[PDB]
Design an enzyme around this catalytic site. Sequence first.
Site, short mmCIF file in Angstrom:
data_model
loop_
_atom_site.label_atom_id
_atom_site.label_comp_id
_atom_site.label_asym_id
_atom_site.label_seq_id
_atom_site.Cartn_x
_atom_site.Cartn_y
_atom_site.Cartn_z
N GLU A 97 96.32 72.50 22.25
CA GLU A 97 95.77 72.56 23.61
C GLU A 97 94.24 72.59 23.59
O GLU A 97 93.60 71.77 24.25
CB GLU A 97 96.34 73.77 24.35
CG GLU A 97 95.52 74.26 25.55
CD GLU A 97 96.02 75.59 26.08
OE1 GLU A 97 97.09 75.61 26.72
OE2 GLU A 97 95.34 76.61 25.85
N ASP A 112 102.62 68.68 25.63
CA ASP A 112 101.62 68.66 26.69
C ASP A 112 100.19 68.45 26.16
O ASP A 112 99.39 67.76 26.79
CB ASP A 112 101.71 69.91 27.59
CG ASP A 112 101.35 71.20 26.87
OD1 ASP A 112 101.59 71.31 25.64
OD2 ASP A 112 100.84 72.13 27.53
O1 LIG Z 1 100.80 79.86 28.67
C1 LIG Z 1 99.96 78.99 29.43
C2 LIG Z 1 98.49 79.28 29.15
O2 LIG Z 1 98.20 80.65 29.44
C3 LIG Z 1 96.81 80.97 29.35
O3 LIG Z 1 96.61 82.36 29.61
C4 LIG Z 1 96.89 82.75 30.95
C5 LIG Z 1 97.94 83.85 30.92
O4 LIG Z 1 99.21 83.29 30.55
C6 LIG Z 1 98.05 84.52 32.27
O5 LIG Z 1 99.05 85.55 32.24
C7 LIG Z 1 96.69 85.11 32.62
O6 LIG Z 1 96.79 85.82 33.86
O7 LIG Z 1 95.74 84.05 32.77
C8 LIG Z 1 95.59 83.14 31.66
C9 LIG Z 1 94.96 81.88 32.22
O8 LIG Z 1 93.91 81.46 31.35
C10 LIG Z 1 96.25 80.68 27.96
O9 LIG Z 1 94.83 80.82 27.98
C11 LIG Z 1 96.63 79.28 27.48
O10 LIG Z 1 96.31 79.14 26.09
C12 LIG Z 1 98.12 79.02 27.69
O11 LIG Z 1 98.43 77.68 27.32
#
Ligand SMILES: OC[C@H]1O[C@@H](O[C@H]2[C@H](O)[C@@H](O)[C@H](O)O[C@@H]2CO)[C@H](O)[C@@H](O)[C@@H]1O
Length: 627
Positions: free
Chosen positions: A50, A221
Site C-alpha cells: 500500500e 488493492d
Molecule cells: O485497514 C485499512 C487502513 O487502515 C489505516 O488505519 C486506519 C485505522 O484502521 C482506523 O481504525 C483509524 O481510525 O484510522 C486509520 C486511518 O488512517 C491504515 O493506516 C492503513 O495502513 C490501512 O490500510
Amino acid sequence: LGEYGQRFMWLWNKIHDPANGYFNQDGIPYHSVETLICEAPDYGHLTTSEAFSYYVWLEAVYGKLTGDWSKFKTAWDTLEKYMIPSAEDQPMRSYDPNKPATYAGEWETPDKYPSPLEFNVPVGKDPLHNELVSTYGSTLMYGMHWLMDVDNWYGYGKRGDGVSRASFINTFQRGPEESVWETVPHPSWEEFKWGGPNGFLDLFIKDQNYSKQWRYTDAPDADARAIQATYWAKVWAKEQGKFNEISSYVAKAAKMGDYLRYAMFDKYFKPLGCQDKNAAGGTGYDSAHYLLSWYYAWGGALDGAWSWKIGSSHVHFGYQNPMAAWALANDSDMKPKSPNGASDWAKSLKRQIEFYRWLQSAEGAIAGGATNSWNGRYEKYPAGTATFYGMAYEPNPVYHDPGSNTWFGFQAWSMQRVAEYYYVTGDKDAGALLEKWVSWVKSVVKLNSDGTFAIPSTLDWSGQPDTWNGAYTGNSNLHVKVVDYGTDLGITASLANALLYYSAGTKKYGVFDEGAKNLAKELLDRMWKLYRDEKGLSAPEKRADYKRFFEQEVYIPAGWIGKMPNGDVIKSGVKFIDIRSKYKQDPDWPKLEAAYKSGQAPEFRYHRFWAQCDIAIANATYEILFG
Ligand SMILES: OC[C@H]1O[C@@H](O[C@H]2[C@H](O)[C@@H](O)[C@H](O)O[C@@H]2CO)[C@H](O)[C@@H](O)[C@@H]1O
C-alpha cells in the site's frame, strides 16, 4: 504553478526531505514517520505494498507537474528491488496447475487455529499458470508481498539471515477475529530458526509433518493502485512527449497486472456458488469471480519438492479498481503480454462495476462485499441470502471485529478510482453510481460554520441488497448509518480527490456538479489552513485502543512454546507487548505508559506516508483538473 500545484510541491518536499524520516536508508518508505502506531501494520517502521503503491502515485503526479520522471522511475526501481520477492526469495518448482494447493478451513476465532489441512477436499484447476510461464519464461510471480520489516526491527532478516533490512514478514493468518493486536509476527521465509520446533507453521496450519518453506501474500488493492498510478504516468508523459523515458516501467505495471489476475479466482479454485467443500473443483474460469479479492498467495518448499498458489473467496468493494482494470483491458500501452490478460481484465472491469452497483445502499454508500466461501469453509448460505453471481453478500468481508466495512475510508479510496474511470470513459453506470454516492457524501460531511470540518469515521449497516440480476433496484432495504465522526486527513483528501474527478466528469459528460467541486475545495482549503506542521499535515487523534498494548492476550496453544528473534518467550497468556518487548525502547513509550497508568487515552499527531501522499495528490488534482 498555481496555489494548488504549489501545495503539492511543499508537501512533496517535506516527504522527500531526508531529515523528516519518511524513508529508510535504502529509500524504502515506512508506514509512518512515527514508530509507535498499530492499525494494520503493528509498528510504524514496517511498510506495506500500500505504502509503495502510494509512493509510485506521488511520483507519477510529480512527473505531471514538473516533467521530471526520475522520481517515478526510482519509486518503481525501489518497488521491484525490495517489495517483489526476487528469484532467490521465491524459488518455485514442481507446481501442479491441476492441484494448486491443499485445502484448510477458516475459523471464527484465533483459538481454533492451527487449521487442519484436509487432504481429501477437492481443489480446482489453475488456468493462469501455464499461460504466464509461456509468456514470461519464468515461474517468478510478479506481485508485491504486502508486509515488510524495513529496518529488521523484528530480527528475521532476509531469507532467515537475521540481519538484512527489507525483511519479508507476515502477521494475519488466524481468521476474521484475529485483530492487529492478536497476531504472531513471523517470517515469510521459514527455516525453523525462530518460533517453536516447526518455526511458526503449526500456529496456523496443522499437518502431520513440516518442511522449511517460503510463502508470500499479495494485497490486490495495492498492486492495482500501482497500475492505476502508472496509467496516469503513461498518459502524462505521453502528453509531454516523454513516454519513452518511462516505457519499461509502463511494462512493469502491465506484467504486475498480468499476475494480479490470481486475485480474480476463488481461494481453492472452487466453482462460484458451489456451497460445498466436498464439491468437485473448477475446471478453469468457472472458479473466477473476476473481482479483486482480499489476497492471492503462493508458497513452496525450500528444497523444491512442491509449491502452491491460492486466490481468495472473499471480496471487498474497497479493493476494486475500475481505472486500473480499464487501462489493462483497453489501453494498448498498458495491455498485458499474455494471450488472455487483457480479455480477463475486460471481464473484471464489467464485473467490478456491477459489484459496486449491487452493493449500493438505499442512501448511496457502498456495502461491504461478498464471499464464495461461507465462513471460509464453502458452507451453504442461509435461506434468503442475497447473492451476486453465486456469491453471498457479506456486510463485513474477511474481518468481523471490528467489521472491515465499518471504516469509512474504503468509501473514499475505492470511489476515487470509479470517479477517475468515469472521468476518462463517461461510463453511464459509473456516472449513475457516483451521482447517488456523491449525493450521500454531501448529506454526511460536516462543513462547520467556524471553519472546521468532520468526515464519517465509523459506519454501521443493516439489511441486504436485492439479489443481483444485472440491474440496480435501489436496494431499499440496505441501509448505512454514520456511527461517529473524525478528522482523518488522508481519507478527507481521498474524498476530495474522488469528488473532483466526478465533478470534472459531469462537466465533460452531463450537468456540471459545482457543489461537488466546492465541497472538495473547501475540504482541502480548511485542512491546509488548520493542520500544517513541521513534517507535513497532521490532526490530533486519541487512541484509546492502545490499552490493548498491555491488555490484549495473544492466543497461543497450550504446550506450544517458542521465541521471537530478540528472545521474547512465546507461550499461552502472553500479551501484545510481551512478544514485542523492543517497543519499550520507543521514544513514545513513556508517553503511552503515562497515559495508560493514568487511565487516559494517548493522543498522537501522525504522519502516515499514504495520508501525506493522498493530501499531496488531492491538492495537485485540483490544479490538474480545475487549474
Ligand atoms: O485497514 C485499512 C487502513 O487502515 C489505516 O488505519 C486506519 C485505522 O484502521 C482506523 O481504525 C483509524 O481510525 O484510522 C486509520 C486511518 O488512517 C491504515 O493506516 C492503513 O495502513 C490501512 O490500510
